Amino acid sequence: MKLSQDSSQIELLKELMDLQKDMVVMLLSMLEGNVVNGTIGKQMVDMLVESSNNVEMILKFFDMFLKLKDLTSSDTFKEYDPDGKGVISKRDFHKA
Amino acid sequence: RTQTGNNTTVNIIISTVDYLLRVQESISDFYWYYSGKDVIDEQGQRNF
Amino acid sequence: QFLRTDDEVVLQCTATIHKEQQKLCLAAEGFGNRLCFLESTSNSKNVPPDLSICTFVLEQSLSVRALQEMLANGHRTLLYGHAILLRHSYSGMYLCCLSTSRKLAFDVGLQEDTTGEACWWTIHPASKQRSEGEKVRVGDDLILVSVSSERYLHLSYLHVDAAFQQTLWSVAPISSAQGYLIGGDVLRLLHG
Amino acid sequence: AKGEAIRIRSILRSLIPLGDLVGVISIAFQ
């Protein structure tokens, strides 16, 4: 939340998102030999239930950044400006 | 993990889980230190 | 199995006056008697002890940095090392560390206002076997340290006062449905 | 209001409890 809001925090945000990817690769590769009602899946269900309140935050944080390129490649973001080389004013971004 | 032939097995995998837990809690209690101040310094970045 | 937020518990020592296994528990009256006292519960068949005024409910659990975030101005599990609220389950008053004495030990009693540093109590494992950050199961043996005075919740000789010296504190829960009988309840007795 | 400074200062209150003035004055004659 708070790192994605400044200029010179983007390098540390690179660091933390790479650690994020390695943590989910870890427990995904832990998850690989489930049976159906495996104990390890039930453990992971319990730690997703216990940590629900902030997986809230990270999934909303991803939904607000997939819908970005759902928008800006298609509708009219590239079409307000005639050049289309990365210039849009802040009210010109808000009103879109 | 199991260390079959030897006398007293040392399960190294629960030990590296314990080191991951110690690094986690020190990360979380660095975060609570920076939770209010909201402008991370150069020292905070280079350490973090 | 575990002690989670809002689970009604007691607090219970063991004190030996010439080999007494007198499991006295931490009682608080409220209502014109703010101080705490002890409710001896090892004669539990000789005396069916007063268990109404001895139960406490964990209102809120927080780590120390979380407590400082609260002092900048929901059934989570608690861990060793956290500072907790102990409401008195009966009178609703929060257990705090009073600034009154009756040597160097403050009196332990109740209050209304949840704000301040007095209501909160940091937990410590009383073991090298159990350590920081890991969970607190049912039936553990823990240490309660005040936040304000940083005094242990000491068992004097039988007062209870917040002093500099440790004392074990066992926690055996009381409860954790709708329209169903639960022990300790108060009821009327209809006939037809 | 530093928090920790206040707390510590209260712990310093809690011992040597301001009855120290006898040990102040009874020096000033001897």
DSSP letters for D9-26: HHHHHHSS-S-THHHHHT
Question: Would you tell me which residues 117-146 of chain C have a C-beta closer than 8 angstroms to some C-beta of chain B?
Answer: 132-133
Place of tokens 């304000």: C148
- Which residue of C69, C132, C133 is in closest CB contact with B32? C69
Contacts of B21 in chain C (CB under 8 A): 133
Comparing CA positions, the residue from B18, A44, B12, B33 lying closest to residue C134 is B18
Q: Are C48 and C19 in contact (CB under 8 A)?
A: no
What does the block give as tokens for C57?
């409910």
Count CA within 13 A, CB hemisphere, residue C79: 10
- Specify which residues C95 forms β-bridges with: C110
CA angle A37, A39, A45 (to 5 degrees): 85
CA distance D18 to D30: 22
- Residue of C103, C150, C161, C164 to mutate, interface with D, max D Cβ within 10 Å: C150
* Tokens 């209010």, located at residue: B36
- For residues C90 and C30, the answer to whether their CB atoms sit within 8 Å is yes
What CA–CA distances, in Å, run from D26 to B28, C166, D15, D17, D20?
55, 37, 20, 17, 10
Residue C175 CA to residue C182 CA, distance in Å, equals 9
Q: Which of C52, C33, C29 is nearest to C41 (CA)?
A: C52
For residue C7, is it left (φ>0), alpha (ψ between -120 and 50) or beta? beta
* Documented resolution in Å: 3.6
Contact predicate C93/C57, CB 8 Å: no
CA distance C104 to C150: 13
- Does B34 lie at the interface with C, CB-CB under 8 angstroms? no
Closest-CA distance, B12 to chain C, in angstroms, reads 19
Alpha-carbon distances of C63 from A2, A39, C66, C131, rounded to whole Å: 21, 30, 5, 15
Length in residues, chain A: 96
- Which chain B residues in 12-31 lie under 8 Å from chain C, judged by CB atoms? 21, 25, 29
Touching subunits of B (3+ CB pairs, under 8 Å) are: A, C
> Cβ contact (<8 Å) for A12 and B40?
yes
Is the pair B, C in contact (3+ CB pairs within 8 Å)? Answer: yes
Q: How far apart are CA C99 and CA C147, in angstroms?
A: 13
Element (H, E) at A65: helix A52-72
Q: How many residues does chain D have?
A: 30
- Count the neighbouring beta carbons within 10 Å of the beta carbon of residue C78: 21
* Residue A55: count of CB within 10 angstroms of its CB: 11
H/E run at residue A14 = helix A10-30
Q: Residue B46: which residues within 8 A CB-CB, separation 6 or more?
A: none
Please tell me whether residue C110 adopts helix, strand or coil conformation.
strand
Question: How many Å apart are CA C150 and CA D14, to the nearest integer?
Answer: 11
Q: CB pairs below 8 Å between C and D: how many?
A: 13
Grouping H, G, I as helix, E, B as strand and the rest as coil, residue B41 is coil
